[PDB]
Design a protein around this ligand. Sequence first.
Ligand SMILES: Cc1cc(=O)[nH]c(SCC(=O)c2ccc(S(N)(=O)=O)c(Cl)c2)n1
Ligand SMILES: [Zn+2]
Length: 258
Amino acid sequence: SWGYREHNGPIHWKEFFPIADGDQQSPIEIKTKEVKYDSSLRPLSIKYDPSSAKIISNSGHSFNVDFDDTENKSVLRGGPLTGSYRLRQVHLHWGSADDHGSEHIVDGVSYAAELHVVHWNSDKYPSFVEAAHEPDGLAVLGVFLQIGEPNSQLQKITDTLDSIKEKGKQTRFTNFDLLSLLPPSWDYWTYPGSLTVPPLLESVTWIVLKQPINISSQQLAKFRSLLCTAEGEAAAFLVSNHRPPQPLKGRKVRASFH
Ligand SMILES: Cc1cc(=O)[nH]c(SCC(=O)c2ccc(S(N)(=O)=O)c(Cl)c2)n1
Ligand SMILES: [Zn+2]
């Protein structure tokens, strides 16, 4: 099965999922002199209910905070989006070293990690599952992490990781104030792309915030202790789980600011 190890990592994914070589793949290099300022883009309209968070799990590929998306308590609107995108899931990407952990790269600068906040278009689709197969179905907010002072909201996640070390394990997790976790500035870049993991579907409107948030080196290192392997399998650690940048193939990256 797919992963980030030598045999099963990003270079080999095209072997099980050919769209890995598609024309709208993510992540990408963001080259700021090539981005087009677009005055029709709107500021982000963000509403996240801290009670929406319910469970945190180890998928084998990252941790997932899953949100109750039964109704429209936590939604993203504005930005490049038409209509209302419902919060589903938060997860993180990192690398084995603090200087190279993010998926999107900005003029060659990788960050220490990158948080993804995944939402789905419930104004057009009846479920996440249906939305995930259409070009306008998903919207992902990408937030960079840089090493700095410890982050008291991320401490809440790190404190759970010992209880979910094995692939498949879950624990309850709620009262998570995702709105306060975001950086001061919500200036962003946006482009049409894909999931950055298999099945790599080309259904995502990416919204990548320019300003990073801080995490300490000790908090970040805790994520690398997660196993990519299940209880009863030979242990291997998820030291790195970021996909390299993919060809832009003529897509327009736009900025909400200039
Ligand atoms: C978000 C979610 C909930 C769920 O129940 N199942 C799944 S399958 C994984 C998936 O669809 C997915 C994974 C990664 C991403 S990412 N790395 O943020 O481009 C996305 Cl948009 C979607 N994903
Ligand atoms: Zn992701």
